[PDB]
Amino acid sequence: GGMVAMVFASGSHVFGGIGSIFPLFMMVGIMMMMFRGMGGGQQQMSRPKLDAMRAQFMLMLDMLRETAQESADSMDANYRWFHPAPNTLAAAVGSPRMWERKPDGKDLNFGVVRVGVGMTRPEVTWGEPQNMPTDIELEPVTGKALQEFGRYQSVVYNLPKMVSLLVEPWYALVGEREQVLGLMRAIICQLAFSHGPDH
Amino acid sequence: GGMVAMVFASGSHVFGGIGSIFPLFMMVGIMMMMFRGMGGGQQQMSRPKL
Amino acid sequence: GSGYGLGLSTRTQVTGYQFLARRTAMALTRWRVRMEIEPGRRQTLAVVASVSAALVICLGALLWSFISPSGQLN
Amino acid sequence: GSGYGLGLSTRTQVTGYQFLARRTAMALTRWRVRMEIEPGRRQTLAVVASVSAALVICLGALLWSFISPSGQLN
Amino acid sequence: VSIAEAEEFAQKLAQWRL
Amino acid sequence: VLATGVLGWWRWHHNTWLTTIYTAVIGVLVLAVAMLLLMRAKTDADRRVADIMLMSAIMPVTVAAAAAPPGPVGSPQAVLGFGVLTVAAALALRFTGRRLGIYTTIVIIGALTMLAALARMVAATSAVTLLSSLLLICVVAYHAAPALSRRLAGIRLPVFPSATSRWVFEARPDLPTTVVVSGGSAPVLEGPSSVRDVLLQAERARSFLSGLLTGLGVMVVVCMTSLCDPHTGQRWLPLILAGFTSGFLLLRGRSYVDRWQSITLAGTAVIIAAAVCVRYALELSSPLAVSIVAAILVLLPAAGMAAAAHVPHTIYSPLFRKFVEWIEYLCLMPIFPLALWLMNVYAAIRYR
Amino acid sequence: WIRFIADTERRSQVIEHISTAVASDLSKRFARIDPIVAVQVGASMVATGVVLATGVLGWWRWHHNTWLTTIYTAVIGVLVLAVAMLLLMRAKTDADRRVAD
Amino acid sequence: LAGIRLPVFPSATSRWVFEARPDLPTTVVVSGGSAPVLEGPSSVRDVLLQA
Incomplete structure (x- = not known):
């Protein structure tokens, strides 16, 4: 400001009008340089490294996702192999899979009947993260990532659901006749295909 | 440099002695910020070392 | 629900959004997310450099306009 | 697989390749690789310095052309 | 399942014995 | 379309009002049929027919408006024409949800040409200048293409301070959605509503980008x-x-x-x-x-x-x-x- | 016709983080560019080029029906034909034959 | 010109395998010295000619 005023007091009047664009741009550039914030040798935290740490964390998380999915496929095949859909049973009558169920203690599937499909908890067992930072210390990106991961990857969808005859004196079916009789017919043929008249 | 040069073409020649001390001292202030800008070091990694 | 509307925000949140924005932008054109190298940044920076250089030459023209004008006839 | 095509590359890889090349150039002429000293680079830099010194003199002459103009048929 | 499907399944099963 | 062609050729050599007046009814008729087909259409085959007719109606309506101004043809006619074309295409896209590609292409060429002709209308300027400006706008546009295509497809990127609360790892997972098929009337569930919708958005994103690039390619x-x-x-x-x-x-x-x-x-x-x-x-x-x-x-x-x-x-x-x-x-x-x-x-x- | 139709029932699959999810699904529904297609693109463009060359050379003769037009066009024909012969003799699959044709 | 080729970098898309099944040795023949012989992998055997 001292230079411009001195030039103006000296009578040059050169910076009048558009010439003022030079002092104007200069003043702005000086302001940006002194407004950059803290950058040191110890205060190393900056976008170029935080992004890398963010990038490294996302990549590691996906390999854990792959491990879960690989385990989940194993459960789908196994449960279907033991409790198929009612419509597939008609062709299977000649197969050795019929009247396969046994009561001799080791067969845990005795007295269990397929009633439909739904949600179930996988065979995986998740360990809580050690040294968890407090809510104010949590980085926002990795927080929701780990948060959403636990909610969806903790259950497996579209699996065959079952009911056990060994657990209750009765099971009251409440709804319209068509639903009630429909399922019972499904229950009757499932029982009949998997268990013999001797049991 | 442009801001100073533009005044000479006008002929006011206000610089020299009294006037020049401002741009002269002002120039040092800009260099002094970039030095603070390059802060830190001593990690010691380099092409010839690798 | 949560997250909706014009609430407050912080500087760490501004970069967080840009990180997700680049990663998703990459997935649409390259169909993979490894991001060993992050080319979007460089290609963008190249444009910014281009724009800056044009303005620098332009001001150079303004500088000469005062140094040696056309009004000095006769 | 096998690294076919023109994929992007990291700066760490660039020096790696250039290092294996220098080591290989030495084997063909000196038939050994201990390389207590690496004359290959030392000898190369001297040429770069000579060309650089030549370009500086041309700038001097080009600069002289602006200080005291004159002409020759060209 | 409908009654027809059940009878169809039931008829197929009635063909077998121990 | 051929009909609009000879009518266009006449208007370029004769200043009479004939073309603009005579073309309007042609468009309304095709538009009505198209309207009837859209209400009556149910199958994918019908959709192909409906889409074709609807697209065919936009052409006459555009030239009809463009031929409306009097005197020698120029900047004013273009501004009106390309403007409604853009409006027609955008509106059709918003409600139709089909043929994203071709319409998007029209939207871009329509929008950019509209701004160009307007400048020549409001100021003399120069052709070299109007063209060069489009070149630069396109150069920056090519870098933005992947971003516009994200927002247009409705992809959202949630960021919030974890509801100002700690992680609830044991929360009850989301309830799966139920679906049916016309022939396969027996319903089956396929999964969470939040996740399944992302699949539709992705192909739409791919679709906008493909068109967006095509529109830009033409302009350069x-x-x-x-x-x-x-x-x-x-x-x-x-x-x-x-x-x-x-x-x-x-x-x-x-x-x-x-x-x-x-x-x-x-x-x-x-x-x-x-x-x-x-x-x-x-x-x-x-x-x-x-x-x-x-x-x-x-x-x-x-x-x-x-x-x-x-x-x-x-x-x-x-x-x-x-x-x-x-x-x-x-x-x-x-x-x-x-x-x-x-x-x-x-x-x-x-x-x- | 009597036929056996297999069971399609299987578990559902979900990916929550949107970027990974977009990449996974998008990678199955479409085909990436490959060298086989690339060669066909090359062949198509060169064909389009020469037909454009003949077009302009054929227009020049209306104003100067000199020997240039015929002399210039003849050598192009020979070169292209010579290449196709080697391609026809070297071809192994219909893709290669499309290139040659 | 001699065909020396520097080893290719794995470009960080795979993990290191310490013991994959080793490369199969190669056999050679001569008319007079009719008995066939083997001497090593193709990847190594060529270096003796390239040099």
């Missing part, structure tokens, strides 16, 4: 081929600009993995060269000019096939790979500085 070829001229002084200045522009687009192609998206970028890069060659031979016709042009016009594409066949089976050391990459950045940098020179900006200020 029209613009680049008009800026160059065989008589104007400093002939090589606007010509080299076409080179860097082509190089940039050609190398940029390796950034896209889709079959048609990558090809369209390359095709765009090649057609820009071919179109410039033809113009340089018709005007300033001479034996040497036609001899050289004919060679370039056959050798250039010939070199490409050679490169296309040999690069995929060879190995290259990192130092060369790093070199081809930097060619792109070096090509981008000169575009703006060169465009302003062609626009005479530096001389205008220097002669303030």
